DNA sequence: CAGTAC
DNA sequence: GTACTG
C-alpha cells in the first residue's frame, strides 16, 4: 500500500531499520510475505520475521517474572551463589515489558566465570530458548546474549530475552546501564562528561582526559562502585530509584 | 554504515 | 552517551 505504513511494517522486523525498509521498498516489496519469499534475509532478520506478531506484543509483568525465574533456576543449578536480576522496564516497575532483561553476577567475584555457555546450553535442552540472535563474548568480563524464549504450556508467545553475565566489581554500573531508561542513561553519561568523568556499563571513571573538541584522548581511573548509590553520589546526584528513572 | 542495547 | 555485532 502507501509508502509510510509499508516502511513502518518493514521496520518492525528485528534487524531491519529505515535503510533496509527503504531498500525493500525500492525492490517493490510491500508485504511481509514479499520479504519472506524474495528478500535477502539476515539470520536475525529471518528470526524477527518469523516471530513478527509475537515481538510486537508487550508481555504482562507477571510473565517477565516467570521468564526471569526460568533463567534463575537454570543458573542456580550450576551455582546457588548466582544472583539474577531482571532489569529494564521490569525493574523500573512497568506493568508491561517489551522484553526481559536478565543480569547475572556472583558475590564472591569469581564464580560468574564459565556460566554463560552452560546456562544457554541448559536453557536450550529445556526448550526454553528457541532462537539465538546475537552473542557478545568480547565485552571485557561481560558476556551478552540476545535471543528468543518461550514459556512452556499452551497459548505462549515468543519473547525477546537478553542475558548478561558480569563480574561483581562491575555489578552496579551494569545494573545501572541495563535498567535504564535509555534517555536516563543518556543524561547521566552526558552529565558525567561535564564533570570530566565517564560512565559505561563497565565502570565510572574520574580524571578522564578530553581535548578541545571534547574528544576523549585518555581514560581516567576507575572508581570503585559497589552500589548504584555510589555512582549517584560521585556524580553529585540525588539517588533515584528504578521507578524514578523511567525517562 | 546499519541496527541494536539501555 | 557508550558500545556491541551484522
Swiss-Prot record:
Mn(2+) binds at residues 99, 101, 162. It comes from the Eukaryota. DCTP binds at residues 58, 89-92, 98-101, 185. Changing residue 99 to A: Loss of polymerase activity. Residues 92-101 are annotated as: Involved in primer binding. Residues 17-20, 138-177 are annotated as: DNA-binding. Expressed in a number of tissues. Abundant in testis. It is found in: Nucleus; Chromosome. Interacts with PCNA. Interacts with PAXX; promoting POLL recruitment to double-strand breaks (DSBs) and stimulation of the end-filling activity of POLL. Interacts with XRCC4; promoting POLL recruitment to double-strand breaks (DSBs) and stimulation of the end-filling activity of POLL. Interacts with NHEJ1/XLF; promoting POLL recruitment to double-strand breaks (DSBs) and stimulation of the end-filling activity of POLL. Belongs to the DNA polymerase type-X family. DNA polymerase that functions in several pathways of DNA repair. Involved in base excision repair (BER) responsible for repair of lesions that give rise to abasic (AP) sites in DNA. Also contributes to DNA double-strand break repair by non-homologous end joining and homologous recombination. Has both template-dependent and template-independent (terminal transferase) DNA polymerase activities. Also has a 5'-deoxyribose-5-phosphate lyase (dRP lyase) activity. This is DNA polymerase lambda. It comes from Homo sapiens.
Amino acid at each position: 500500500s502507501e509508502s509510510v505504513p509499508v516502511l513502518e511494517l518493514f521496520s518492525n522486523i528485528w534487524g531491519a531499520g529505515t535503510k533496509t525498509a527503504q531498500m525493500w521498498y525500492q525492490q517493490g516489496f510491500r508485504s511481509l510475505e514479499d520479504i519472506r519469499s524474495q528478500a535477502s534475509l539476515t539470520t536475525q532478520q529471518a528470526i524477527g520475521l518469523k516471530h513478527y506478531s509475537d515481538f510486537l506484543e508487550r508481555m504482562p509483568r507477571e510473565e517477565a517474572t516467570e521468564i526471569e525465574q526460568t533463567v534463575q533456576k537454570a543458573a542456580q543449578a550450576f551455582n546457588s551463589g548466582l544472583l539474577c536480576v531482571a532489569c529494564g522496564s521490569y525493574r523500573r516497575g512497568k506493568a508491561t515489558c517489551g522484553d526481559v532483561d536478565v543480569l547475572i553476577t556472583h558475590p564472591d567475584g569469581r564464580s560468574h566465570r564459565g556460566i554463560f555457555s552452560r546456562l544457554l546450553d541448559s536453557l536450550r535442552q529445556e526448550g526454553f530458548l528457541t532462537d539465538d540472535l546475537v552473542s557478545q563474548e568480547e565485552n571485557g568480563q561481560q558476556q551478552k546474549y540476545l535471543g528468543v524464549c518461550r514459556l512452556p504450556g499452551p497459548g505462549r508467545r515468543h519473547r525477546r530475552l537478553d542475558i548478561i553475565v558480569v563480574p561483581y566489581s562491575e555489578f552496579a554500573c551494569a545494573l545501572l546501564y541495563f535498567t535504564g531508561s535509555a534517555h536516563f542513561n543518556r543524561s547521566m553519561r552526558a552529565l558525567a562528561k561535564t564533570k570530566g568523568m565517564s560512565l559505561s556499563e563497565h565502570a565510572l571513571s574520574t580524571a578522564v582526559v578530553r581535548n578541545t573538541h571534547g574528544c576523549k584522548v585518555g581514560p581516567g581511573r576507575v572508581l570503585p562502585t559497589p552500589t548504584e548509590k555510589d555512582v549517584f553520589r560521585l556524580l553529585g546526584l540525588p539517588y533515584r530509584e528504578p521507578a524514578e528513572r523511567d525517562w
